[PDB]
Symmetry: C2
Subunit: 1023 residues, 2 copies
């Protein structure tokens, strides 16, 4: 049982590498191997100091390794010590805040975006007094820094990119070198991405796949005389490191050595190192999914691929006797439950009787199932898959029978009447093949006659069908009640509350039950007739809102309502959507709130029990008769039991299957998938930690050589995330005291855009921080750490300014202050543009193409659009999908004005730019950022300035998580530009005028891109 | 910075030892050292298997290392694996469930009490299939097992005893050896304790301090030819281990080697090994103590020797600027607080102004302070110390001034009137010096006149004084309302509800305010006169109960009441006492409940705010006006910050100081303390973990060579305790199925005395366990582990018996089943005695002298006391303090009878034994068990059978915990027997008839002690 070895470093005969998230050292001389540091969290990088004594270590924390910081290790005494309390943000693809290199004097230089407004701005800092002080190198963003003959060698974006092999976009690793104690020149800028640079002798060695596969290459300190030193074909090599004589690297889970003076390469022998307990325990609620109420007040729920039948208290628990991957569980009868079992071949319907213990499992493959339901009479089930098919599966035999297939999207919204006769479901459709909107009409399938009827017209979005217990009327919801709501900031309107319920009587001549038409006055007593039933449709007198479900009951109707809310929290913090359960009394037509803070709701078969999930993440259950008597469903009384290796294989196969099933190009997916399966599967058995599996899975994802192949979430550690204490200030260790070097502030009147000290009426800039909470900080006391320990609370800070100016305030200590730095940056550039253009040019920045981008764009757009010129800076734009909505605004051509008796002119359109527009972009703007960039040029809105963009334009829409919560993405939607095809993918967008931002530009404190932008517009504004 | 090394083992040139709770291996040949296993919890023992490849490891879990289990380590692949799921109970002094040795075939033999009714019954088991099965050796309790020339060598109680040096009691380690494939003979039984036995060649080497200090000795396999091989004088040697050629051991934190063939000893060189981060973070609530309400709705609380002023939400927090050991914090004024700072020299009064930040700290030593209060006017404080003095400390200067000194106990119950003029306090007293009861009278000190008056008489217990806001009446409580409550089981009565409140008007001629005497009819308007004020005392018309506090308010009186409850939970589970806050309306005289589930209550200076702690451990605060508006006091918003080394030094000094201050003999304490301080202090800086400090502290505690020097609680790890799944059954691996070998049951009708399977109406004995919760158990499936993971819930168990007898039940899986085993044992012995004496002899067992012993004694006493003879088995009796109450019952001599018209004779006394009594005791009965034993003989109640007892009769009453929760105990009360002095200490009690229970007795399944007891009584019963 060998281990997966990676990320090595070397010094003489000693070699340190990572194994099982812990750091190991190996001695070539004796062949001995030992763990020198562990239990710190997941370690992904370790670097020997010059002397080969101390070791800088990067370690990640937070279940999803969402945070990271650096530690020092002194091999002499075996002392460990945290150096940075920045709590840097990191992701698998971008594992920022790391060791950058070492300076001549032996000092550690780190790369971090912790004090920057943008994550890609990983600026270089010289570490001092072990984290007491940080000195900026001002060389701009960089991943590696080397030193050759007194010359600084800069490596930009030179980290590894296993998730995207053959990458050739604008963010591809490049190398620069100093030529004149401040003058820099780019010396390595190949077609492909260059990573892990090192220097042996007077040559720079790096990795690249310019030839189709990862190999080691080198050039002189001028980028001339290229040479290929390896011919690997099994696994890409990674993480080059050296001591000055030999080069170390990992490959296929092993450590290799390359001697430049011999061009000889050899695998170091390590063998078995650690095999932890395979059987692990987990908290079921942590991975719980799908919670459903059963007869007898029992509960069923899925967690980590396992299923369980239990009482609400969680004292009596039964595990479903079925191997890994149960996706869904559903009431199938008195003591029976149907379930969906997933394997590598696909999804299958299964049944389990928890009273007798029997559990058959059909062999008919249903495809990739995303919805499942069983009729109240336990005769058949209804299933939806990714083939866009809706079908019934005979629970007796297993024979699936397709009812209908949509060609637009999945048919997951359906319901079965209580008499098991009809099936109502939302059927996605389009009027045209290239139509921008997908409509949805409700369809009804009659088991007798086996014919499909149209419950509703196809002009909008109809959903949430529900039959009344008697099976006489079909209720459902629609977004057909168009009525606009005004925007409070921008001249705009949208449909916020246009949801309303409707009903359809299954017997013609029968009226809408909620209309309360006297029975004596209605001559019903007809028979079922679903023909032209959409004509008999009728609404129910309920105020329009945003409804997600309607449950018709005897003398009332329950409705799930979602109040209008912003999308920022849900978009960047996974914040769940808060709903409330309403009750509509049919007789009094009065509405009332039955339960709030809801995030999900399920209803019993007999409509008597209600199961819900609230905003606190907990699951509750209450009788529909007495909602005041709810109980909390306990699931953690019993540990979840599993096998690391069984899960790892399962997860790898699923990741591999998703990558294949969702790749935008099917043909390509066929070859790529089959050609990489076994290769990466062979490494799975060597994995013992989640991080190990990640290394393997991401590498197999890179085989698609396409953008947007990510791995998010998941449980890699149980260590609490690193914390950082922030007050939006920059400290400088001057003498033996810290001085506020800078106090950040954007718009003083906005929320959260300045240092909390401003609230006391003083600008902290220039003051000395005497102490925090009675503890002296300074020369001998790391202010970053002290703040770290007060994050999230208020601490008494003692400040000293000009003269006897002494202050004693209770300061809020933030957990983060990125946004404050960001807005400060924006206002700075905005002030700068106004001053340099003498008040003739506006400025707007767009951070991403998501919700934040929409905020920032309008936040400044409403005040900067009426200058003679306008600069639209989209540098560092993280993408998303709203580029089209913004482009639309910038496309508005001003063609008129409004002349008032009093006041000033009003432009028409209101949302139009007044004059010339100029766009600024860089290699850090990508995806929707790529699309916006290409678009701006394509529509001729103005000139595009900067550097070629990222080049990743194949979008994603994940719809599955691994059994551990992990969310993998697959490039499923290839963007095609008219007159460019898919070309932007793996290339990016070239600016009309290329303006590099070299390292010497940063040293001079000048932004060449913005200056050119200003100068250019000024030149254009002379008419 | 060297580390503390301990508990080593050797095999060739490799040597494994423990450092920082982790396991290390060291190679003598290369001098290399490495950590081979970590993050498992605290490891205290590791043993090499025969081949020198696998390693058996004992690891502890639970914050207080309250649990333990064994693991295997395969150095070949580096595989780790849990072997036992017994979750054995352990304590520092008794670290049970360990490796016992290895058999010739290379099989591991363990010692454990996990399946026994008594913790001392650490029986020997041979491990099989890595924990799948355990085979009993039936050699009785044993710590070590060795093999010499096919002969089994047994070591009883041979573990180390660092907390009791020079121990010579009945439980001292002894060695036995086999002489005839079943016949055993005791061969090493010295005056002192023998530990860590090993065999090199044909000699047994062990440790002992027969000469005054720990040294290594050896004898031949007959116990003859004793030899001393070392002459240490610095630190006792410990943990002997060998490979057959050399002997390994630890001393003063270093590893040594002893070569028997040379008699040469040398320290192995290891040097620095690991120095973790000194600065640690802690959860404040985990170590919180003392919570007090301040002005402005602020809160003050002490935690881990630190103090803090915060708002109830815990968002605004101030740490008091004072070095380690703040014991108490109290409101001193608007924005001032008084505190008690403790150092090695003693306790000091200090003041801190949290508004200005100033914080003076007086230098006058107050002694060991146990109570502190400040007057409402911030002029002076009141303090109580262990010198039994009550005093006032001028908060302006610091000059303490003793008011009065008690010669019985501390004066910690006091109060100060609102006008700061009087001080009322409980004054402990005795009528005679040798009086068995300490009385308590309330005393009042008048600052003007400086005279002390008697508020109450000295005939009982008066407490909880409280002045009314106007300072006109003194309220207090008393246990003077004698009224008996009947016992439901035994003919007995006790005072349960005899607490009643009383008041005393400070102005003679003024009536009891709660009597509602019309003002017009009372001619008050007098002046203060405290003379003979105890004569004017008056009660308030409130039903008697168990009151702990009285708070007089304007038109009502608050009273804290504690419902009558059992003591078992509080005695063995630390369960807190539940109280309720009552309100007594002075006008209507009606009482009502204001708040329940309380465990503690504090009241504001202005009597407007109430702060409480509830049974959930959380702290709450509510206005006295609207108790429905309580808020939870949050304290964990901010991490607690400290330094390992500063705390370790602090804790060691405190432990050392307590050991000196509380030792029963002052003279002795003077010499012992000063002679050991530096010696053990030098090891503290080598400690990096709590377990490290424990090794050092306990060793310094052993220097007192007295019993009852323990170390309990504390936080050693953050690992969850080991769990064990029990169903009160013994499984046997027969073939590839487990069969219930034994199904335990005591009294089927009592609560918790049988296997939960019995509730289904079947005896599981003989059945086969097919599976548990769908999972097959047997040959390839450790049932202990499966159960382990279901503990605390119900699982479906499939059983198979005679023929097609198949059962499927939901069985409760217990977390423990010791009590069930215990009662089963007792009922077995009880049945046995009845059958062997032909129904002429009764039987009773006493497990301890605490609450459990009281239960068990009466549980059988009421049915076994009227036989011709009676056996009182007190074997394994854990001690406590109720021996005197039990001896009293056994002392009752029957001298009469009651003759009824109908029915049978009633004996007088009812609680008398009818005939001859016989006591049984062993070396596992100690302390109060020693006392009971000595007593039985001394009073001539009957003959005493068995083996000499433990020998620890110097009692404890701890009253301080270390800053981490640790509870240390000091032998403070030397028991003196008339005509024996303190002799029993470190010796025990010799039985009239010695009856060894040798290893071959256990092999024959016979209890020689009980048989002799029966036979003896039978012989005595022939008259």
């Amino acid at each position: 049982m060998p281990n997966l070895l990676l990320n090595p470093d070397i010094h003489g005969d000693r070699i340190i590498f990572v194994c099982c998230d812990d750091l190991w050292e190996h001695d070539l001389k004796s062949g001995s191997t030992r763990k020198i540091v562990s239990n710190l969290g997941v370690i992904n990088n370790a670097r020997f100091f010059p002397d080969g004594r101390k070791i800088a270590i990067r370690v990640m924390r937070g279940s999803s390794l969402n945070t990271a910081d650096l530690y020092f290790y002194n091999g002499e005494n075996g002392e460990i010590k945290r150096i940075t309390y920045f709590s840097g943000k990191s992701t698998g693809r971008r594992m920022f805040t790391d060791v950058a290199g070492f300076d001549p004097d032996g000092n550690l230089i780190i790369s971090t975006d912790a004090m920057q407004p943008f994550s890609s701005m990983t600026c270089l800092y010289r570490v001092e007094n072990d984290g007491i002080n940080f000195v900026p190198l001002n060389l701009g963003p960089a991943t590696h820094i080397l030193f050759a003959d007194g010359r600084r060698v800069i490596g930009r974006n030179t980290f590894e990119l296993p998730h995207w092999k053959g990458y050739r976009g604008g963010t591809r690793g490049k190398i620069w070198i100093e030529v004149n104690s401040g003058a820099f020149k780019k010396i390595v800028d190949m077609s492909t991405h260059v990573s892990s640079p090192v220097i042996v002798g007077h040559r720079i060695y790096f990795i690249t796949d310019i030839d189709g596969f990862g190999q080691i290459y080198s050039t002189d300190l001028d980028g001339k005389d290229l040479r290929k030193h390896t011919s690997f074909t099994d696994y890409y090599p990674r993480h080059l490191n050296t001591d000055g004589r030999r080069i170390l690297f990992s490959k296929g889970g092993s450590i290799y050595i390359f001697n430049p003076d011999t061009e000889k390469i050899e695998k170091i022998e390590i063998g078995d190192l650690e095999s932890p307990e395979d059987r692990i325990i987990s908290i079921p609620s942590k991975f719980a999914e799908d919670f459903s109420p059963l007869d007898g007040d029992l509960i069923a729920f899925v967690s980590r691929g396992q299923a369980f039948i239990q009482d609400v208290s969680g004292t009596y628990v039964l595990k479903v006797p079925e191997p890994l991957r149960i996706r869904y569980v559903r009431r199938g009868g008195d003591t029976k439950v149907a379930f969906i079992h997933g394997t590598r071949e696909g999804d299958f319907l299964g049944i389990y009787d928890y009273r007798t213990g029997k559990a058959e499992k059909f062999e008919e493959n249903l495809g990739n199932v995303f919805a499942m339901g069983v009729d109240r009479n336990g005769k058949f089930a209804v299933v939806a898959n990714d083939r866009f098919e809706i079908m019934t599966v005979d629970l007796e035999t297993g024979k699936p029978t397709v009812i209908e297939r949509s060609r637009e999207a999945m048919i997951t919204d359906f319901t079965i009447s209580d008499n098991s006769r009809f099936i109502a479901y939302g059927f996605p459709l389009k009027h045209g093949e290239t139509d921008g909107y997908v409509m949805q009409a409700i369809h009804v399938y009659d088991m007798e006659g086996r014919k499909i009827f149209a419950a509703t017209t196809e002009n909008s979005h109809d959903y949430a069908p529900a039959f009344d217990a008697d099976s006489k009327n079909l209720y459902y919801l629609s977004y057909r009640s168009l009525d606009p709501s005004p925007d409070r900031v921008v001249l705009n309107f949208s449909f916020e509350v246009v949801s309303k319920p409707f009903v359809i009587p299954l017997i013609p001549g029968s009226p809408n039950p909620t209309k309360l038409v006297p029975r004596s006055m209605t001559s019903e007593a007809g028979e079922y007739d679903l023909n032209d039933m959409y004509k008999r449709s009728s609404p129910i007198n309920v105020d329009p809102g945003d409804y997600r479900m309607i449950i018709p009951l005897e003398s009332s109707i329950l409705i799930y309502s979602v109040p209008v809310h912003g999308e920022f929290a849900a978009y960047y913090q996974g914040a769940p959507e808060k709903g409330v359960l309403l009750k509509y009394d049919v007789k009094t037509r009065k509405v009332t709130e039955v339960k709030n803070n809801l995030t999900d709701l399920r209803l019993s078969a007999d409509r008597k029990t209600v199961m819900v999930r609230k905003d606190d993440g907990k699951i509750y259950t209450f009788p529909l008769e007495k909602p005041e008597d709810e109980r909390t469903v306990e699931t953690d009384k019993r540990p979840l039991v599993s096998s690391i290796h069984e899960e790892f294989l399962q997860m790898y196969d699923e990741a591999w299957k998703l990558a294949r099933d969702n790749y935008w190009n099917e043909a390509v997916a066929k070859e790529i998938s089959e050609r990489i399966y076994e290769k990466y599967r062979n490494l799975v058995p060597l994995c013992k930690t989640r991080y190990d599996l990640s290394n393997v899975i991401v590498e197999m994802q890179g085989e698609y050589r396409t953008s947007h192949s990510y791995e998010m979430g998941g449980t890699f550690t149980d260590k609490d995330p690193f914390r950082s204490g922030r007050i939006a200030c920059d400290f400088k260790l001057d003498g033996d005291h810290y001085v506020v070097a800078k106090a950040y502030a954007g718009d003083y009147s906005n929320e959260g855009e300045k240092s909390p000290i401003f609230e006391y009426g003083i600008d902290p800039t220039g003051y000395l921080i005497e102490d925090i909470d009675g503890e002296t900080v300074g020369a001998g006391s790391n202010i970053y750490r002290v703040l770290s320990e007060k994050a999230g609370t208020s601490a008494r800070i003692r400040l000293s300014g000009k003269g006897g100016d002494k202050r004693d305030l209770m300061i809020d200590i933030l957990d983060d202050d990125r946004f404050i730095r960001y807005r400060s940056w924006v206002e700075a550039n905005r002030r700068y543009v106004h001053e340099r253009s003498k008040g003739t040019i506006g400025y707007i920045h767009i951070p991403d193409m998501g919700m934040m981008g929409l905020n920032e764009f309008y936040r400044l757009f409403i005040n900067e659009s009426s200058y003679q010129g306008l600069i639209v800076d989209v540098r560092f734009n993280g993408g998303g999908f709203v580029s089209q909505l913004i482009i639309e605004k910038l496309m508005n051509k001003r063609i008129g004005y409004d002349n008032p008796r009093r006041g000033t002119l009003s432009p028409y359109p209101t949302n139009s730019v007044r004059g010339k527009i100029i766009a600024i972009t860089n290699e850090y703007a990508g995806s929707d950022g790529d699309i916006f960039s290409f678009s701006f040029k394509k529509l001729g809105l103005g000139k595009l300035i900067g550097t070629r963009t990222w080049g990743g334009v194949v979008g994603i829409t994940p719809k599955r998580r691994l059994i551990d919560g992990t969310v993998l993405t697959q490039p499923e939607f290839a963007f095609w530009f008219r007159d460019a095809g898919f070309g932007v993918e793996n290339y990016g967008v070239d600016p009309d005028v290329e303006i590099e931002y070299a390292p010497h530009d940063y040293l001079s404190g000048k932004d060449p891109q913005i200056d050119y932008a200003i100068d250019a517009l000024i030149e254009e504004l002379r008419n």
